[PDB]
Amino acid sequence: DQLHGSRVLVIGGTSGIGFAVCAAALGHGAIVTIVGSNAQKLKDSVARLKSSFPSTDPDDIVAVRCDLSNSDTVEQDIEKALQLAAGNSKINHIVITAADMTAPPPLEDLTVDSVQRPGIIRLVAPLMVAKHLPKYMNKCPQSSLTLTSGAHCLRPDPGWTVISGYCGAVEAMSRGLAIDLKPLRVNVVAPGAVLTEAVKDILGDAYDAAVEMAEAKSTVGQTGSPESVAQAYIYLMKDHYASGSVVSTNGGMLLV
Amino acid sequence: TDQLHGSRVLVIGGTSGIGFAVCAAALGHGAIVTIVGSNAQKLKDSVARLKSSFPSTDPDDIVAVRCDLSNSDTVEQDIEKALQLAAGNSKINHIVITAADMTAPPPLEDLTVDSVQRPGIIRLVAPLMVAKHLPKYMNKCPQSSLTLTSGAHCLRPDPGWTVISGYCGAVEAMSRGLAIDLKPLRVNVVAPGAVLTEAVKDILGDAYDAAVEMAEAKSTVGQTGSPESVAQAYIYLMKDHYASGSVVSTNGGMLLV
Amino acid sequence: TDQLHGSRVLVIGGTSGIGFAVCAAALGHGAIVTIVGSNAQKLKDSVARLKSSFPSTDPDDIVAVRCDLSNSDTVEQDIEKALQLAAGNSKINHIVITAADMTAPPPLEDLTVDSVQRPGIIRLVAPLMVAKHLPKYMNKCPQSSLTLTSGAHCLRPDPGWTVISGYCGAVEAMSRGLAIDLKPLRVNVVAPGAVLTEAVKDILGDAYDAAVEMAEAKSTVGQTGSPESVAQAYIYLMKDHYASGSVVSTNGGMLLV
Amino acid sequence: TDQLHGSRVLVIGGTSGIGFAVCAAALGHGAIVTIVGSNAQKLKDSVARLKSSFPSTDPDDIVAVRCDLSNSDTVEQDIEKALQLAAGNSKINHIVITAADMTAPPPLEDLTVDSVQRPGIIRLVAPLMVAKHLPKYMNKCPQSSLTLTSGAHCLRPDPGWTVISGYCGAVEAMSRGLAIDLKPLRVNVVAPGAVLTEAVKDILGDAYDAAVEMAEAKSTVGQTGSPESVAQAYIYLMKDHYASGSVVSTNGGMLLV
Ligand SMILES: NC(=O)c1ccc[n+]([C@@H]2O[C@H](COP(=O)([O-])OP(=O)(O)OC[C@H]3O[C@@H](n4cnc5c(N)ncnc54)[C@H](OP(=O)(O)O)[C@@H]3O)[C@@H](O)[C@H]2O)c1
Ligand SMILES: NC(=O)c1ccc[n+]([C@@H]2O[C@H](COP(=O)([O-])OP(=O)(O)OC[C@H]3O[C@@H](n4cnc5c(N)ncnc54)[C@H](OP(=O)(O)O)[C@@H]3O)[C@@H](O)[C@H]2O)c1
Ligand SMILES: NC(=O)c1ccc[n+]([C@@H]2O[C@H](COP(=O)([O-])OP(=O)(O)OC[C@H]3O[C@@H](n4cnc5c(N)ncnc54)[C@H](OP(=O)(O)O)[C@@H]3O)[C@@H](O)[C@H]2O)c1
Ligand SMILES: NC(=O)c1ccc[n+]([C@@H]2O[C@H](COP(=O)([O-])OP(=O)(O)OC[C@H]3O[C@@H](n4cnc5c(N)ncnc54)[C@H](OP(=O)(O)O)[C@@H]3O)[C@@H](O)[C@H]2O)c1
Ligand SMILES: CC1(C)c2[nH]c3ccccc3c2C[C@@]23CN4CCC[C@]4(C[C@@H]12)C(=O)N3
Ligand SMILES: CC1(C)c2[nH]c3ccccc3c2C[C@@]23CN4CCC[C@]4(C[C@@H]12)C(=O)N3
């Protein structure tokens, strides 16, 4: 594997998809830097990651708490996470899955700041990553930055139009960063229905009616496993020719 | 013959360029047009020629309102005023939004948190505020339409205008979400290519002639797009009562070479 | 005032359904329409039904030609003749192709090499034969247009019409290739959704009523597409001299739910 | 550690180019590879190349069969032998199709009904014949995959390859239909960009060095695609048990410039 000695920055690797990416990354022996905002399960996630890979050097699994939902500190924090992840070396791949995980208000009660508050973590944080990565990454086709969107960008869930919009912005912005940061490669993974611990939290009591309706809306009779969706991120790290692309893993939900 | 005769159109951003050609086309079909802009004068100037290129129309079918949508205070109450004015005694039949800041972004080496967020109030919050308040001034019927604006830069972004390609990418995704939020009302996007509007003359300054010639060369047609040809996409989307959630791309085959 | 008045329109497949509505819309703008079909009876009925909806139109603006484009040994020759009389004295301005066999394919249990290959003559070979010979009969100029036909089934295919989803997917890609082969002439595609033409009731037989509800429900609008609304997409692509390499999708938001 | 270890992979078109790189990658994970080609020599030679780069693998994990899929008789029966072979006593886990004629089409001045039709036997009929017979040789299970092949030319067609761009458009649409026909089995497409296989040098001849220089410049990366990088997309779809109905594009950003 050519991801053995690799340094990968997983912005949002404390839970769900991003965590599965650090598990997959550690399976190939890479050095993984994790970024989250909750200090306690960031201890739990990183402690959880070296008992599933106990032969891996513990110093190759580093964590930092960063709050990227706040307009100050995010440039200072993104720059700090790139310093920690780069170390003496340069970072080889960056993965961003961080999202605010909050239900928007209905459209009749839409507020100006309601529209803008997601943009800080969906748009401003990656752009600050794109702002500062040349100093911490070599702009060569062997390095990658991968952003996150979803199938909801084409089949929006009801109530979620605004965040459904921002994922549309992530995909267009991804392509622009492939020109801004060329020949460095940047791409997007667009997952479908992944039953992460966060999703269980969002829908609460309406969860099981939603799981069965998600399973029914797939060519597979399934929702997506977190470690299978993680293969899309690993793919874009190993494919030194993929750039400006959208990797869609949705179980055929857009076909039914 | 024409079903846009008695129909009411609100063109948010119709004072120049593409939006103005949409108001000209709408009045060519006899529609009642309300125009929204920010420059106080040049808003009379386009209102002046449209009763002078078609004096046929009753002068009260061409009404105008000044709105500043670049500032987060003022945006909900300004669109609300323009919707009361376009609807009048009836309800609005079609809404067209072309309003955009049209100012050069910084390079991303000097990217600031404010550079990223300020385009969104006119590109994202203004249309969402339209979607918030249009039900009381439009009937939610498939004979009604709301059309947003995109570009080919959403798929082939201009160096480096990455941040605003994102917002146009957000416009397309948001369009689809609003097509289900406002069902059975129709929501769509127009994605123009290279149109030589009076703003583009201003933004390109001295690099204009080198850019016009490379735009004509990046086309299957050997030309740039007329504003009056692109306006047909907005007029088309008002007449097609089955088109919703779609992107009408008119770019001279630019994405093909 | 209208720029489709003197123009020559050839609708390959204008004897029924969507293509027929395109000739109705074209005649509303005063165009000279040549109709092409394979059924001598559906071709006399179509020209008769168009001289009772437009009695003021000159009878020479509605001429028809009989062509069987499902057969390989004469599809090139038939296309050639259709072109020559549609141009007449002058040149052809726009060509619209909707022709399709509209017969259910066999299930995958009985798929045959010929089942897969026969549709290609009318879906792929006839349009390519049109592009091969139109230069003597059209000005390859941006005010000229060639429009092919696709559907939403190319992205949401219907069971078991997988093979015809393939051919409609092939039409969209070649559309883009012919915009470069035929540049600066304009080539585009319309992708309709659910249009209840007379061919569609024939395929659905007794399951028709259950299928209409199914479609109606599965759309953002509460409707199927009118033939006269989908026809707006073809007329639009004739009026927008900048639209090229594009896909005009008319689906009632079916791809959103 | 590896879940492609006991896995049986059928690479239809693995004697050269991309499909060959897919068989190399599969054997790196310990998969059992069945290779299909039409050149007996290439096929033995290709199998010889693979057991000298992997001398430790059991030679029975590298089995080959000669198939001519260019002809209407024997193509269903050759697909059927190849399925028995790959399956053996177990069932097939993944199928990869890269087989293509790789010959320059004639110009449109000499376009014939047969030049158009003939590619469809290997572009469309062979995969459909694979989907027709694989259920007795594959589970219809989410852990098994069928991967077809398209390319970036389906969206930015190279001249004069319009007809072959069309067939690649059919493969992607057919992929989506086959993802529903064979559900819950997974069906997908890989859309490579510029890969300098020996077949591409054969087509480009003396214009090769000028063509690679213009291909490298038309990418965001300053390179063409490695066969070993593009093969990772096929391996990925074996690895992602949630990917279905998708297009994995690996083109070096050529569609951005
Ligand atoms: N799951 C799906 O079906 C689906 C579909 C489409 C798109 N997506 C996108 O996939 C990505 C991953 O989603 P997920 O299912 O894995 O949910 P998740 O487990 O909640 O992932 C969120 C990650 O981001 C962190 N985070 C939350 N707020 C943060 C903040 N202000 N600043 C920095 N980090 C923050 C979280 O750490 P903390 O513990 O500190 O909060 C966590 O590590 C998201 O972008 C999502 O929008 C998911
Ligand atoms: N022309 C092209 O080649 C091209 C290409 C791709 C995309 N587009 C997009 O198409 C749309 C039309 O562009 P255009 O070429 O026609 O330029 P334009 O003539 O300047 O159109 C701008 C319209 O919106 C108004 N406007 C600007 N800022 C406003 C603000 N804060 N509040 C309210 N109204 C405001 C303008 O009037 P004021 O004078 O009062 O500001 C004008 O009526 C834009 O969204 C553009 O991004 C254009
Ligand atoms: N209806 C829908 O909902 C829908 C949706 C998506 C896509 N489409 C596609 O749009 C196109 C039009 O479909 P439609 O609904 O209008 O069905 P249609 O009424 O049967 O249209 C078929 C047209 O093509 C002609 N035609 C058929 N075979 C011919 C042949 N060998 N030679 C010459 N002409 C031939 C027909 O005339 P003859 O009487 O001589 O056969 C007729 O004018 C089709 O390609 C269809 O697949 C339709
Ligand atoms: N390289 C690119 O730039 C590029 C770009 C887009 C798409 N693609 C697509 O990628 C696929 C792979 O191409 P490639 O470049 O790897 O070319 P390649 O090496 O020529 O691949 C051809 C493969 O197909 C087999 N094949 C050809 N004709 C056959 C027949 N009649 N029966 C059975 N097998 C047959 C060949 O075997 P024999 O020669 O043994 O018969 C060989 O295994 C092709 O579909 C190509 O169009 C390639
Ligand atoms: C819609 C959602 C509540 C949901 N409902 C499910 C049912 C079954 C399996 C997964 C889900 C999910 C995951 C989602 C996907 N959406 C993409 C942008 C906003 C949202 C909301 C959230 C998100 O971030 N996670
Ligand atoms: C890039 C731009 C300066 C430009 N350069 C040209 C050269 C030749 C012909 C047209 C143009 C245009 C029109 C554009 C298209 N872009 C889409 C989003 C931002 C921007 C900027 C502006 C816009 O709104 N109008």
Ligand SMILES: CC1(C)c2[nH]c3ccccc3c2C[C@@]23CN4CCC[C@]4(C[C@@H]12)C(=O)N3
């Ligand atoms: C599938 C079909 C029988 C169908 N079943 C419906 C139920 C409700 C409303 C509309 C339909 C339609 C319209 C379709 C769409 N398909 C696109 C290519 C082939 C086909 C077949 C036909 C076509 O041309 N018209």
Ligand SMILES: CC1(C)c2[nH]c3ccccc3c2C[C@@]23CN4CCC[C@]4(C[C@@H]12)C(=O)N3
């Ligand atoms: C067009 C082609 C001759 C070509 N010309 C190049 C110049 C520089 C770098 C790469 C190429 C290629 C690779 C291509 C891509 N096309 C996709 C379908 C048919 C074809 C033909 C062939 C293919 O399979 N490989």
